[PDB]
Write an enzyme that holds these catalytic residues in place. Structure first.
Site, PDB file in Angstrom:
ATOM      1  CG  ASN B   9      28.787 -58.682  52.001  1.00 38.11           C
ATOM      2  OD1 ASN B   9      28.252 -57.572  51.852  1.00 38.11           O
ATOM      3  ND2 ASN B   9      29.145 -59.150  53.197  1.00 38.11           N
ATOM      4  CE  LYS B  11      32.999 -58.188  53.627  1.00 30.89           C
ATOM      5  NZ  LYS B  11      34.046 -58.562  54.651  1.00 30.89           N
ATOM      6  CG  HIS B  93      28.605 -60.754  57.130  1.00 30.42           C
ATOM      7  ND1 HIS B  93      29.675 -60.102  57.715  1.00 30.42           N
ATOM      8  CD2 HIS B  93      29.071 -61.271  55.965  1.00 30.42           C
ATOM      9  CE1 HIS B  93      30.734 -60.207  56.930  1.00 30.42           C
ATOM     10  NE2 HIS B  93      30.399 -60.920  55.870  1.00 30.42           N
ATOM     11  CD  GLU B  95      32.315 -57.520  57.740  1.00 26.94           C
ATOM     12  OE1 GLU B  95      31.381 -56.871  57.183  1.00 26.94           O
ATOM     13  OE2 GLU B  95      33.291 -57.966  57.096  1.00 26.94           O
ATOM     14  CD  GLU B 163      30.873 -64.482  57.492  1.00 27.17           C
ATOM     15  OE1 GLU B 163      29.870 -64.491  58.244  1.00 27.17           O
ATOM     16  OE2 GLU B 163      31.511 -63.441  57.222  1.00 27.17           O
ATOM     17  N   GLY B 169      41.723 -61.821  59.268  1.00 23.46           N
ATOM     18  CA  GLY B 169      42.522 -60.763  59.846  1.00 23.46           C
ATOM     19  C   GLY B 169      43.390 -61.169  61.019  1.00 23.46           C
ATOM     20  CB  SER B 209      40.379 -64.529  51.956  1.00 19.42           C
ATOM     21  OG  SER B 209      41.064 -63.791  50.983  1.00 19.42           O
TER      22      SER B 209
END
Lengths: 250, 251
Positions: B9, B11, B93, B95, B163, B169, B209
Site C-alpha cells: 500500500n 498510500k 483502511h 486511515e 491492522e 504510532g 508494521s
C-alpha cells in the site's frame, strides 16, 4: 478580472470517452480572453495532460489537507502539481454535503494548496432547507470566513457559488437570483478582506450551466464565469459555454 | 488453505520519478511463484504503473466510491479502477476509518459493490488502543467483519487484512504472537458466521508494521497468510524480499 470557465467532470468518464472529449476540445476554436480549466477524475489526469491543448489548464477535483504520507486513498497537492495541474476545486457541494467535509477542514485545504502554488477554485453555497429559512447569506458568509481566516492570499483564488437548493431540488435558479448572491459575495470581500481583492477576484456561477443559458448568465454584472457540471462532458457544448464571453461584451 | 498474499500500500506517496524507479526495482526482482502480489499506487499514478509494471503483479486502488459514478466530485468509481487495469481495491483502511471517518456500513456497501462489479477486495479491520485496553478488540473487529459479511455477495475474492491500529504510532509494539491471536479468532469468526469453506480459503493478512527485518518471522505464524505492507512497499528490493518471505512459511 478575466472571464473564467471551468469544467468539473466529476466522477465520470473512461479512457475512451475522455479521449473523444479531449479530441473535441482540441478541435474547438476558443475565444481569446477566457481562462479555461477542466477537472478530470484523478486517474485520468495523466491522459488529459498528455493530449489536451495547453490552452486549457487542468484542475484536481479535491486535494489532501497537508503534505502526503499515511493517508490511504488521498491525493496531495504535490502529486497534483507533479501531474501538471494548476488548480484544485475545494469545498465542492458534493464534498460538503455528500462526503461531509466541514468548513475549517476545507479552509485548511485551501491555505495549503495556495501556499504550495496551486490555484484554488473555492466553492460555497446554501442548501434548500437553509435558503427556506432565510439563511442564504449567513451560510455563504460563514463559508467565506472559513476560507478568509485560513488562506495566505486571495491572488490565486476563484470563488464559485453553487445554488445547492436548486441543484436537484426541482427548484430552478434565475440569473437574477444568481446575480443577487454574487454581488453580496463581492460586498463581503470588500468589507472583510479588502477593496482590491473584491474587484480582482472572480466570482463564477456553479449552478446548472448549459449551452441554452450560458449566454444569458454571462450578462450579469457580477457573474465572472462558470463552473460547469454535466455540460463539461460534451466537448462542443462546453466550448460554446466558454465562448459565451462574447455575450458579456455585447 | 489459501495462496500467500502480499500487498503493497503506497498510500499518499510518490511522484512520477520515484514511482518510475520503484517500478524498475519491482520489475528487476525475482519473485517466488506461489504468491499473489499486489501494489496499490495513488490514483493519479495508476495509469503510469499499469503501463510499465510487470503483469506478474496486480494493481489495486486505495479506495473506491460506494456505487456507480456520477455527481461525486473528487471520488473514483470501480468502473474507472477497472478501466485503468486494477484487479483489487483496498477498503476500510484504518486511515480511512479513523482519519477520514468512513463508517462500517458505508465500507461494507463499497465492498459489496466492488465485488459485484468484479474487483477483488482487500477488506481491512482493526481496533484502536482505547478499544483494545477496554477489552473490545473482538467487539470492534467482529463488528467490522459483520458489516462486510452482511453486505457482500460472496467471499471468493475477499482478502481480510488485520491492522493493529493500537500499535500504529501509539508507542505500543505488536508481536507476531499478538497478531496470531487476532487472526485465529477472525478465522474462527468466519467459520461460525459464513462457513468452514470460506474460513479455510480466505486469506487473512497482517497489516501492522511489516519490514525486511520481521516478515520472515511473521510469516511463520499459522494464521498469517501474508501482508499488507506500508512503508516498506515504497522500497522495491525490500518489498520483493518481503514477498519472498513466503519461503519462511514453508520452513
Amino acid at each position: 478580472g478575466k472571464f473564467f470557465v471551468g469544467g468539473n467532470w466529476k466522477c465520470n468518464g473512461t479512457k475512451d470517452s475522455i479521449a473523444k472529449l479531449i479530441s473535441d476540445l482540441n478541435s474547438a476554436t476558443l475565444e481569446a480572453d477566457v481562462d479555461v480549466v477542466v477537472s478530470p477524475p484523478f486517474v485520468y489526469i495523466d491522459q488529459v495532460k498528455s493530449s489536451l491543448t495547453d490552452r486549457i489548464d487542468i484542475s484536481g477535483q479535491n486535494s489532501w489537507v497537508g503534505k502526503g504520507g499515511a493517508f490511504t486513498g488521498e491525493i496531495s497537492v504535490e502529486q497534483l502539481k507533479d501531474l501538471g495541474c494548476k488548480w484544485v476545486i475545494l469545498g465542492h457541494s458534493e464534498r460538503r454535503h455528500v462526503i461531509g467535509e466541514k468548513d475549517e477542514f476545507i479552509g485548511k485545504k485551501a491555505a495549503y494548496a495556495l501556499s504550495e502554488g496551486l490555484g484554488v477554485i473555492a466553492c460555497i453555497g446554501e442548501k434548500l432547507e437553509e435558503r427556506e429559512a432565510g439563511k442564504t447569506f449567513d451560510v455563504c458568509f460563514a463559508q467565506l470566513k472559513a476560507f478568509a481566516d485560513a488562506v495566505p492570499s486571495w491572488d490565486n483564488i476563484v470563488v464559485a457559488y453553487e445554488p445547492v437548493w436548486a441543484i436537484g431540488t426541482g427548484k430552478v435558479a434565475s440569473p437574477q437570483q444568481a446575480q443577487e448572491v454574487h454581488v453580496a459575495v463581492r460586498g463581503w470581500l470588500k468589507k472583510n478582506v479588502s477593496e482590491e481583492v473584491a474587484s480582482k477576484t472572480r466570482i463564477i456561477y456553479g449552478g446548472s450551466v448549459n449551452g441554452g443559458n450560458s449566454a444569458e448568465l454571462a450578462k450579469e454584472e457580477d457573474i465572472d464565469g462558470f463552473l460547469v457540471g454535466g455540460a463539461s462532458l460534451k466537448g462542443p457544448e462546453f466550448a460554446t459555454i466558454v465562448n459565451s464571453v462574447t455575450s458579456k461584451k455585447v
